[PDB]
Structure formats: C-alpha cells, structure tokens
Write a protein that binds this ligand. Structure first.
Ligand code: HEC
Ligand code: HEC
Ligand code: HEC
Ligand code: HEC
Ligand code: HEC
Ligand SMILES: CCCCCCCCCCCCCCCCCC(=O)OC[C@H](C)OC(=O)CCCCCCCCCCCCCCCCC
Ligand SMILES: CCCCCCCCCCCCCCCCCC(=O)OC[C@H](C)OC(=O)CCCCCCCCCCCCCCCCC
Lengths: 72, 37, 218
C-alpha cells in the first residue's frame, strides 16, 4: 500500500501569453439585476471565473457588490 | 522476609538479561522514532 | 507436579518474555513500515511517459532551470514545461525518433502529456517556491542533484518535521542567493556563521512565526 495515488499532472501545449501559472488574474465585466448593469471585477484562477468583486472605478459599484452579483 | 529466589545462582543472570533486553529495546525504539527519518 | 511437567516453569517464564518481545517487535514493524521508502515512494525512479532525462538536458546540453520551470521564482508553482518548449529544439533535433513520438503526438492535437507527479503534497500544505527561492534556498538542499538525474526520484519524504526542522533552524541551509545557479554549489565549512549573517540580512522571521499553523495549512 502507498501513502497516495499516482496524481498524474497535465500541462499546456501552448502557454497563454499573459498568464503566470498559479497567479490569479482579475477582469472587468458587467452583471445586470434589473437590466441595469453593475460593474464587477472577477478573479480568474486558471481561466475559470471563481470570485466576483466590485469595480472601484464603476459608478454604483465602488468596491461594494449586491448578493445577486456575488452568487452569480 | 527474604525473596523466594534469594540464594540462587540464576538471580544475577536473569536480572542482567532483563536489563540488556530493555536497553536494546530502548535504543532501537529511540533510533526508529528519533533518528531513522 | 499434579498436572504440569517440570519444564513448565521455564516455559511460562519464556512465554512471558517472548510475548513482551513480540509486542515490541510489532510496534517496531509498524513504525518502520510507516516510515519506509516504499510507503512514501522515496528513491524510486518513477517511469515517465516520454522518458525525459534531466542529466542530458542540464548536465550535457546545458539548459537553465528557469528555461523550463519558468514560474519558480514568481509564483507558488514551478511551471511544468509545455509541449511548445519541447518543440523549440525537437522540431529540428532528433526528429523522426520513436522515443519523441508522444511529444510529436502533442502539439498537433491539443492533448497534453500526462507526467507522473514525483513530489506530491496532500492539498492541505500550500507550499510556495517563490518566497523560498528568493530567501536564499535552492533546489539542491530542497530537492537533490536533479542536474544529474536521468529519472527524477524523491530525495526525501516531505514530512511535517522536515519542513519544521529548517523553518526553525534556517541558518544551516540558507545560501547567498545564486540558488538557481547550477546546483554545483557546496556549502562552506563555516556554514553556521554565513547562515546566521544571511538570516540577519534577509530578515527571516524567528521560529515564533514560521512554525505557526496557518503558515502551511489553510
Ligand atoms: C500548527 C501547530 C500545525 C498543526 C496542528 C499541524 N501542522 Fe502540519 N504539515 C506540514 C506538512 C508538509 C505536512 C504533510 C506531512 C506528510 O505528508 O507526511 C503536514 C501535515 C500535518 C498533519 C498530518 C495530517 C494527516 O491527516 O496526516 C497534521 C495533523 C498537521 N500537519 C498538523 C507542514 C506544516 C508546517 C510548515 C511550516 C507547519 C508550520 C505546520 N505543518 C504546522 C502544523
Ligand atoms: C535545473 C537543474 C532543474 C531542476 C532543479 C528541475 N528541473 Fe525539471 N522538469 C522538466 C520536465 C519536462 C519535467 C517532468 C518530467 C519528469 O518529471 O521527468 C521536470 C521535472 C522536474 C522535477 C520533478 C517534477 C515533480 O512533479 O516532482 C523537478 C524537481 C525538476 N524538474 C527540477 C523540464 C526541465 C528542463 C527542460 C525544459 C530542464 C532544463 C529542467 N527541467 C531543469 C530542472
Ligand atoms: C521538452 C520538455 C523536451 C523533451 C520532452 C525532450 N527535450 Fe530534448 N534534446 C535536446 C538535445 C540537444 C538532445 C540530444 C541530441 C542528440 O541526442 O543527438 C535532446 C534529446 C532529447 C531526448 C532523447 C532523444 C534521443 O536520445 O534520441 C529526449 C527524449 C528529449 N530531448 C526530450 C535539446 C533540447 C532543448 C534545447 C534546444 C530543449 C528545450 C529540449 N530538448 C526539450 C525537450
Ligand atoms: C529549508 C531548506 C526549508 C524547507 C525544508 C522548508 N522551508 Fe519553507 N521556508 C524556508 C525559508 C528560508 C522561508 C522564509 C521565511 C521568511 O520569513 O522569509 C520559508 C518560508 C516558508 C513559507 C512562507 C512563510 C510565511 O510567513 O508566509 C511557507 C508557506 C513555507 N516556507 C512552506 C514550506 C513548506 C510547506 C515546507 C515543507 C514542504 C517548507 N517550507 C520547507 C525554508 C524552508
Ligand atoms: C524547498 C525545499 C524547495 C525549493 C527551494 C525548491 N523546491 Fe521545488 N518543490 C518543493 C516541494 C516541497 C514541491 C512539492 C509541491 C507540491 O505541491 O507538492 C516541489 C515541487 C516542484 C516541482 C513540481 C511542480 C510544482 O509542484 O509546482 C518542480 C518542477 C520543482 N519543485 C522544481 C523546483 C525548482 C526548479 C526549484 C528552483 C531551484 C525548486 N523546485 C526549488 C520543494 C522545493
Ligand atoms: C490491527 C487491525 C486494525 C484494524 C484494521 C485496520 C485496517 C485499515 C486498512 C484501511 C486501508 C484499506 O483498507 O485500503 C486498502 C489498502 C490499500 O490495503 C491495505 O493496506 C490493507 C491494510 C491491512 C492492515 C492490517 C493491519 C494488521
Ligand atoms: C491497535 C494497535 C495498533 C495496531 C495497528 C493499527 C493500525 C494499523 C493500520 O491501520 O495499518 C494501515 C496501514 C496503512 O497498512 C499497512 O501499512 C500494512 C500494515 C503492516 C503491518 C503493521 C502492523 C503489524 C502489527 C502491529 C502490532 C502493533
């Protein structure tokens, strides 16, 4: 018996240009509740969205976010 | 009151054997748990 | 004498002695098994799908570590090379070779090459190469002579005690940067004095902080 399974690792075939592996990035996008857009900054762990935050430069979303934007 | 075994050739030898066993066990345990890594 | 033979005395005493010896032996076997190299997969050269040899590329061809593991000094993850980096040499060198077929199978289809992870942590440890390397530690006192490793093996089992030994006494392992420089670096005889000076200079925190739980586990 052994401490753990083989745990194979799969890398890329062509590296994304602006990405450093293991470093999350943040992208600016808009989420609408009543059809009115609210600016959001969303963390992309490895090209997948994982955490929505607020956009400090967006009017009506200065850092703060509503629950509906968080639970998207 | 004397021990039942008092006056026996085997008393010192058995005590010695028990002590040697104990020391060996102790050293081996110590090695495995402290120095083997 | 009523129901027992004469040698029953010796048999009973020897049975007690053997029972104690057997208990001690069982404890010893359990400890050794749980601290064995087979259990923790140490010094076992794990066979890889493409048979990559660090000895050839590093010691003979002479390629820097950061050419392949490009993210080692900037993030917690040492970037495993993409097939792009493999093909920048083998598009011309050793082309039409049966042992580079899998590589050539990639870079034409998007399928990756499934390497087997040698150094594996149980996903509650949260290691970071960046701070370590930047603080004067290299992959020789931390990994082994990978420069001369045809097949990479685990040099030591990554025990909690192993990490805590050096987190507590970092003056016996800290080096004057040049940690990515070829690991031909040998520690000097006066390692203690240089290590203390480097600990003072780099500002490595005392064991009061480096042994906290949320340093590793989260
Ligand atoms: C703060 C006092 C703690 C506590 C309570 C624990 N650790 Fe650690 N830990 C580290 C590493 C590398 C491992 C893996 C060990 C291995 O793979 O053999 C662990 C593991 C543990 C365990 C074992 C969990 C299990 O289910 O087996 C436990 C109970 C544990 N830790 C408790 C690394 C570190 C640290 C590096 C700096 C330090 C600090 C801590 N651990 C601190 C703690
Ligand atoms: C400079 C001497 C180094 C050091 C210290 C390491 N590498 Fe590499 N490495 C490369 C590839 C394709 C792999 C995976 C294939 C395999 O593991 O055989 C590795 C692997 C490692 C490991 C182990 C990975 C693990 O999961 O534990 C380690 C510790 C490691 N390397 C350290 C690619 C290259 C490469 C060519 C692009 C070169 C040059 C290096 N590595 C150099 C080094
Ligand atoms: C990307 C991580 C890889 C992989 C998987 C391999 N290489 Fe190289 N490689 C280079 C040179 C100069 C040689 C030797 C040339 C010769 O033997 O004539 C090799 C050899 C290999 C082999 C062995 C092939 C064989 O023995 O026939 C293998 C399996 C291999 N490489 C895998 C040069 C580079 C290089 C710099 C130009 C880089 C980058 C790589 N190789 C990357 C990889
Ligand atoms: C000696 C070669 C070490 C080994 C073995 C391990 N670590 Fe380490 N670690 C080392 C140094 C010199 C430092 C710098 C300390 C500082 O304050 O600058 C560290 C630091 C870390 C950290 C970050 C500490 C922090 O405050 O955030 C982490 C998360 C860390 N080390 C993790 C870690 C683990 C999980 C290890 C076992 C696999 C481990 N280190 C071993 C030196 C050494
Ligand atoms: C401290 C000891 C170090 C140092 C200074 C380096 N490595 Fe790294 N390495 C180490 C551990 C404990 C692990 C396991 C990580 C895990 O999540 O289980 C690794 C892992 C690697 C890997 C595998 C890919 C990855 O985990 O990101 C590679 C590749 C690797 N280490 C290479 C590497 C290089 C190039 C270093 C610079 C000299 C280096 N390690 C330093 C422990 C440590
Ligand atoms: C003393 C008895 C203690 C209670 C029994 C504990 C057995 C626990 C084994 C759990 C691991 C397991 O079954 O997975 C399969 C494993 C790889 O296969 C195994 O490793 C089986 C291990 C059997 C251990 C027997 C101990 C004696
Ligand atoms: C009760 C006292 C402790 C007895 C051992 C209980 C745990 C054993 C176990 O769980 O083995 C699991 C291990 C992963 O599986 C293994 O590693 C295989 C076990 C090999 C034998 C270890 C036990 C030998 C006898 C121990 C007596 C003490």
């Amino acid at each position: 018996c052994t401490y753990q399974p083989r745990q194979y690792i799969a890398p890329f075939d062509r590296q994304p240009e602006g990405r450093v592996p293991g470093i999350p990035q943040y992208f600016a996008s808009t989420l609408t509740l009543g059809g009115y857009g609210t600016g959001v900054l969303v963390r992309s762990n490895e090209g997948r969205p994982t955490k929505v935050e607020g956009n400090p430069r967006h009017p009506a979303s200065l850092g703060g976010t509503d629950l509906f934007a968080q639970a998207e | 009151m004397q021990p039942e075994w008092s006056g026996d050739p085997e008393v010192k030898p058995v005590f010695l054997a028990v002590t040697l066993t104990g020391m060996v066990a102790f050293l081996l345990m110590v090695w495995l748990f402290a120095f083997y890594w | 004498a009523q129901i027992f033979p004469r040698n029953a005395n010796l048999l009973s005493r020897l049975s007690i002695f053997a029972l104690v010896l057997l208990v001690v032996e069982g404890i010893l076997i359990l400890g050794v098994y749980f601290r064995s190299n087979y259990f923790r997969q140490v010094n076992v050269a794990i066979e890889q799908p493409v048979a990559f040899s660090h000895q050839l590329h590093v010691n003979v061809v002479g390629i820097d570590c950061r050419y392949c593991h490009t993210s080692v000094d900037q993030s917690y993850f040492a970037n495993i090379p993409a097939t792009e980096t493999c093909m920048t040499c083998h598009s011309q060198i050793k082309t039409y070779s049966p042992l580079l077929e899998k590589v050539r199978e990639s870079y034409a289809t998007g399928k990756p090459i499934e390497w087997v992870k040698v150094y594996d942590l149980p996903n509650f440890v949260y290691f970071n190469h960046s701070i370590h390397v930047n603080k004067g530690i290299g992959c020789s006192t931390c990994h082994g002579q990978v420069n001369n490793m045809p097949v990479v093996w685990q040099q030591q089992a990554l025990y909690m005690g192993w990490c805590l030994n050096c987190h507590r006494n970092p003056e016996l392992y800290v080096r004057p940067r040049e940690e990515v420089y070829n690991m031909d670096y040998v520690p000097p005889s006066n390692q203690l004095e240089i290590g203390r000076q480097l600990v003072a200079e780099y500002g490595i925190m005392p064991p009061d902080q480096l042994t906290n739980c949320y340093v590793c586990h989260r």
